Amino acid sequence: CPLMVKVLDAVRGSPAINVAVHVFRKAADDTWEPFASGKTSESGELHGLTTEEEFVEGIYKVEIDTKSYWKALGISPFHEHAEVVFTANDSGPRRYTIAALLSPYSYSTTAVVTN
Amino acid sequence: CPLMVKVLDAVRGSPAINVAVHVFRKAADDTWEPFASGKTSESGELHGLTTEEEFVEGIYKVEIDTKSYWKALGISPFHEHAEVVFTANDSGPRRYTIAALLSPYSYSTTAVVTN
Amino acid sequence: CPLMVKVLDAVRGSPAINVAVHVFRKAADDTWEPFASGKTSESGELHGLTTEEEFVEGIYKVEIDTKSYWKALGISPFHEHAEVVFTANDSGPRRYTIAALLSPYSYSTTAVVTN
Amino acid sequence: CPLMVKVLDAVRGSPAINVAVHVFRKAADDTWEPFASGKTSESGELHGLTTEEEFVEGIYKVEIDTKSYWKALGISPFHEHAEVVFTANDSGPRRYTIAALLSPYSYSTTAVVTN
Ligand SMILES: Cc1cc(-c2nc3ccccc3s2)ccc1N
Numbered sequence: 373c374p375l376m377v378k379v380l381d382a383v384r385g386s387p388a389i390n391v392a393v394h395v396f397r398k399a400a401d402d403t404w405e406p407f408a409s410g411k412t413s414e415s416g417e418l419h420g421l422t423t424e425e426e427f428v429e430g431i432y433k434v435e436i437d438t439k440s441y442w443k444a445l446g447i448s449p450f451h452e453h454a455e456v457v458f459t460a461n462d463s464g465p466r467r468y469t470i471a472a473l474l475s476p477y478s479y480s481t482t483a484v485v486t487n
Numbered sequence: 488c489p490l491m492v493k494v495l496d497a498v499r500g501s502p503a504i505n506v507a508v509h510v511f512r513k514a515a516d517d518t519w520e521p522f523a524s525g526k527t528s529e530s531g532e533l534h535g536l537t538t539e540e541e542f543v544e545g546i547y548k549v550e551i552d553t554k555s556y557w558k559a560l561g562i563s564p565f566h567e568h569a570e571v572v573f574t575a576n577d578s579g580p581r582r583y584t585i586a587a588l589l590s591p592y593s594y595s596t597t598a599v600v601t602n
Numbered sequence: 603c604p605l606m607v608k609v610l611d612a613v614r615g616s617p618a619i620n621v622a623v624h625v626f627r628k629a630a631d632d633t634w635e636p637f638a639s640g641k642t643s644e645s646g647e648l649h650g651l652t653t654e655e656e657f658v659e660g661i662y663k664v665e666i667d668t669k670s671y672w673k674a675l676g677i678s679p680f681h682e683h684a685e686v687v688f689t690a691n692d693s694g695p696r697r698y699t700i701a702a703l704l705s706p707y708s709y710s711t712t713a714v715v716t717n
Numbered sequence: 718c719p720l721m722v723k724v725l726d727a728v729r730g731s732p733a734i735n736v737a738v739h740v741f742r743k744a745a746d747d748t749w750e751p752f753a754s755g756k757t758s759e760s761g762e763l764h765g766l767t768t769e770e771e772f773v774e775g776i777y778k779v780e781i782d783t784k785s786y787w788k789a790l791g792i793s794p795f796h797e798h799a800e801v802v803f804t805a806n807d808s809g810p811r812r813y814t815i816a817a818l819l820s821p822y823s824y825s826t827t828a829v830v831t832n
């Protein structure tokens with residue numbers, strides 16, 4: 373509910389299906405601890421990463437494994453992955469959608485924060 | 488069902504709400520005839536523009552009235568509107584989503600074509 | 603000099619070379635009159651479209667012929683072209699760079715306005 | 718010369734000036750070692766980060782300090798920074814331009830790779 377990831381393919385004009393996504397939370401020692409992960413669905417979406425109880429304020433990193441996605445399509449890509457790093461705050465809207473639009477040599481990302 | 492428009496605001500990190508959208512279809516005389524229109528919802532989406540029966544193959548133009556959107560937020564914009572021009576074909580997937588991500592001096596658009 | 607167009611290819615990570623560009627200006631009768639045209643160089647850039655004297659106040663449309671670009675590379679893209687429509691020089695003369703980043707099913711455009 | 722960074726502001730339609738950029742290279746022990754750093758000029762560009770001799774094969778991370786950029790302009794943005802991670806020079810030496818287009822809740826990045 374509170375954190376969703378959506379991935380789109382700008383070459384095929386389609387959801388980016390079966391993309392691995394890893395979420396990390398910054399620890400007190402300034403290391404990235406694993407938090408949640410999954411693979412995007414047939415709709416390009418990854419739901420159920422976390423719960424309101426566990427998604428406390430902090431710095432989070434969403435890593436989208438774009439290189440493996442392009443390699444599986446036979447397309448040489450530029451990036452190792454796409455990383456989205458942000459602070460979650462409780463004074464802001466409650467639902468976070470991290471969206472990424474992928475091309476072999478480019479990506480765009482935006483946050484949609486609602487409620 | 489066959490044609491949906493989704494608009495996002497990259498300044499606020501939100502759906503772009505109440506954006507006027509006008510759809511045109513190219514006529515035989517190479518003029519743009521009005522086809523469908525509406526305003527985006529609270530989710531930034533505009534549904535119900537057309538039906539499968541009416542959405543025949545042809546060249547379509549989706550005009551998103553970005554200038555009025557930014558002016559209503561007190562932000563000086565660059566573009567008069569964002570225009571998305573494309574051919575609809577029956578050999579391709581059946582549902583078209585035209586997505587646009589808006590900033591005052593920039594926009595990005597992508598097509599998600601599924602089924 | 604006062605109007606430059608730069609086009610990049612997000613699939614190859616390269617300038618988009620030999621892209622046709624047509625510029626129009628809205629006339630008093632609300633028709634798009636031809637204003638200037640050209641093709642991008644090896645650097646993806648198109649210079650020398652107009653002069654300070656000729657580039658008067660008005661509403662301009664920069665049409666970037668993306669479909670022909672992709673088709674020549676063996677890709678059947680979504681868009682017919684990318685159109686950038688804006689009011690120019692209404693505060694006085696300015697220098698405009700219209701940049702476009704192209705993918706088969708997506709494009710992004712931004713303006714850099716100086717002076 | 719072999720590595721350049723260019724940053725644009727999609728809110729103002731201008732180069733993003735005085736943006737801090739830190740480059741890291743992955744070491745044999747899989748740690749990110751500092752490689753180069755600098756700030757964008759009035760043109761939004763950062764030149765002279767490295768040399769052909771020093772810019773050997775490896776995995777590099779270009780960290781663009783977008784949060785500090787927006788905060789200085791009175792905007793509380795979403796991202797901590799924009800990170801661009803890529804393998805460089807594995808086919809031989811190349812010239813890399815990392816471009817980023819910034820909005821408060823979104824960024825786009827592309828690579829132009831030549832030679
Ligand atoms: C980064 C980016 C994202 C999008 C989209 N987000 C969403 C989010 C939810 C549903 C459809 C879409 S489509 C569209 C254009 C760009 N550039």
Ligand SMILES: Cc1cc(-c2nc3ccccc3s2)ccc1N
Binds near residue numbers: 701723816
């Ligand atoms: C990431 C991105 C970058 C650009 C631009 N790169 C350059 C590089 C050199 C000169 C002008 C421009 S403009 C345009 C659109 C997007 N989305």
